[PDB]
Amino acid sequence: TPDSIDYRKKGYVTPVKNQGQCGSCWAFSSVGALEGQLKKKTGKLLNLSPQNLVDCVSENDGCGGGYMTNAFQYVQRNRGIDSEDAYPYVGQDESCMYNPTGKAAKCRGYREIPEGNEKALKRAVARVGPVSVAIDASLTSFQFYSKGVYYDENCSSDNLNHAVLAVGYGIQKGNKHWIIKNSWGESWGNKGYILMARNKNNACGIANLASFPKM
Ligand SMILES: *C(N)CNC(=O)[C@@H]1CCCC[C@H]1CS(=O)(=O)c1ccc(OC)cc1
């Protein structure tokens, strides 16, 4: 297991997106994970559609929030998810309009990382690829993050309110971190990314609700 890895450099990560004023973070986190596995299995990197999930996952609440596991389960039973091109993102709750002719991938279930275990999360990222994770992103310090490894003692490990994508991990100036892809546009953080403290007692609850799809 490498001490550092960045899947962006391997071509497993699509450009940073902007969810807008819709609580669809769970959909973006879910598609990012699927995009990573699709690349690993087919060699092709394509943008999958979060709107497909927002509109069709009946177990989630669309722009009102949802779980990534429910998203993977929908893709499995639906036997597919459309490409962004075939089901563009509008940031609004609308009726399910899944188009089978636009299917770009599918999945056959998901696996969850044991709750609170950052070590298992590290092993998963190294062996499988990008992993979907949930965190507390309610702090002002998070909203205005600009550089360095983020850590705020005020972050809650129990108040999970946002979903992002762990695309790697490493160390910066002696501080271990997780490389996180957010969905608030490129103008946020460091070109849409944030480095979050790793092995600092599950900061912000990073390993409390992690999962990845199986293909
Ligand atoms: C993202 N922009 C909005 N946040 C979320 O959807 C959170 C993702 C991680 C897990 C917790 C979500 C918030 S919630 O606990 O209020 C929620 C969970 C499940 C839902 O429906 C099934 C709806 C909201």
Describe the overall structure.
This protein has 215 residues and is of the alpha+beta class. It has one domain: Cysteine proteinases (Cathepsin B, Chain A), CATH 3.90.70.10. The chain has five helices and ten strands; from the N terminus they run βαααβββαβαβββββ. The protein has helices at residues 25-42, 50-56, 68-78, 118-127, 140-143; strands at residues 5-6, 81-82, 103-105, 110-112, 131-135, 149-150, 162-172, 175-181, 193-197, 211-213. The strands form three sheets. Strands 1, 5, 6, 7, 8 and 9 form a six-stranded mixed β-sheet that branches. A two-stranded antiparallel ribbon has the order 2-3. A hairpin with a 2-residue loop joins strand 7 and strand 8 (175-181). Helix 1 packs across helix 2. The protein is globular. The structure holds ligand NOQ. Residues 23-26, 59-61, 64-67, 134, 160-163 line the site of the ligand *C(N)CNC(=O)[C@@H]1CCCC[C@H]1CS(=O)(=O)c1ccc(OC)cc1.
Give the strand content. Answer: 15-25%
CATH topology: Cathepsin B, Chain A
What would you call the structural class? alpha+beta
Rg for CA atoms:
16 Å
Helix content: 10-25%
**CATH homologous group name:** Cysteine proteinases
Q: What are the salient characteristics of this protein?
A:
215 residues; alpha+beta; Cathepsin B, Chain A; 6-stranded mixed beta sheet; two-stranded antiparallel ribbon; 10 strands; globular; binds the ligand *C(N)CNC(=O)[C@@H]1CCCC[C@H]1CS(=O)(=O)c1ccc(OC)cc1
